[PDB]
A = this chain, B = another copy of it.
Amino acid sequence: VDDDDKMLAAEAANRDHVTRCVAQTGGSPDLVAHTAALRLYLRVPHFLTEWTTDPDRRAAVSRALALDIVSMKLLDDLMDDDTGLDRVELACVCLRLHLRALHELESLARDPKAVTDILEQDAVHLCGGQIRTKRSRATNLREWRAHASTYGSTFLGRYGALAAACGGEGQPADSVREFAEAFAMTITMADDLTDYDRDGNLAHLMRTGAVAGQDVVDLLEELRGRALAAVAAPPGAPGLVPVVHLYTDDVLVRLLPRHL
C-alpha cells in the first residue's frame, strides 16, 4: 500500500461523495458525469491533507474540500455559460455542494469560526481578482502570473488554510498554504497549455512570441522550489516531493514543446 494507492482511493472516495451529493439534490446524469470528470479538482484535496496523520480525519477533510472545490468549479461553469448544461441545475447543485462543505468543514474545525474567517479574509482579493482577470487579458508573463495568483494561487491557498484548520493541531498552516499557492500556479499553467487546443492564454502568448519559453521554464522552476521548501517546513510532508516533481516535469517535458 504505497502513496499512489492512498491517492487513488482518496480520489475515488471524493468523486463518490460529490456524485452522491449531486444526484440526491436533483442533478441530471449529464451534470453528475461532468462532476465525476473533474479529475485533478477531486485529487488535489488529497495533496492538501498530506499533513493530516489521523486517516479517518484526513478522508473526511479531503471529501469536504472536494465538495467546495467542485461547487466553485460549477459557479465558474455558470459564469462562462459554455458547457451546454442546464443553468438551473448548475446553480442549485453549486449551492447544495457548498453548503454541505461548510457543514462538513465546520464539524471538523478546532474552531468552527475559522472556516468563515479563511473564506472572508481574502474573499475580495479572490472575487475582485476574477473580475479583473476576465476584463483585461494578459499580454506578457508578468500580467499572466498576476492574474493566475488570484483564480489559481489564492483559490487553492484558501483550501490549504482550511485543510490546516480542520486537519488537527501541529500542521504548519503557513507552509500548507504556501504549498497550495505554488502547486496551484504549476497546475494553472498546465491547464492553460492543455485548454488552448481543447485571449490572455499563456499558450497563445507563447505561440505569438509575447512570452519566451525560457521565462516559462524559470517560473516553473521557481514554483517547484517554492513547493519543495513549503513541504520541508516542520513537521514536513515528504509524500508531496514526488507530486511537485510529477506535475512540474509534465509541464516542461509534455506541454511546453506543444507551444515552442
Interface residues of A (CB under 8 A from B): 24-27, 72, 75-76, 78-81, 87-96, 99-100, 102-103, 106-107, 111-113, 115-117, 119-120, 123-124, 126-128, 130-132, 134-135
Structural contact, B99 and A116, CB atoms closer than 8 A:
yes
A24 proximity list for chain B (CB < 8 A): 124, 128
* Bound-complex Cα distance A26 to B111 (A): 31
Cβ contact within 8 Å between B102 and A112: no
Number of copies of chain A assembled together: 2
Q: Is the CB of A113 within 8 A of B106?
A: yes
Contacts of A95 in B (CB 8 A): 72, 75, 123, 126-127
**A102 partner, pick from B25, B102, B134, beta carbons under 8 A:** B102
Q: Mind listing 9 A-B residue pairs with CB under 8 Å?
A: A24-B124, A25-B131, A79-B87, A79-B88, A80-B87, A88-B135, A102-B102, A103-B116, A103-B120
User: Is B132 in contact with A120, judged by CB distance below 8 angstroms?
Assistant: no
Residues in B whose Cβ lies below 8 Å from that of A89:
131
By the criterion CB–CB under 8 Å, are A131 and B92 in contact? Answer: yes
> Is the Cβ of B87 less than 8 Å from the Cβ of A128?
no
Which residue of B81, B102, B112, B126 contacts A87 across the interface (Cβ within 8 Å)?
A: B81
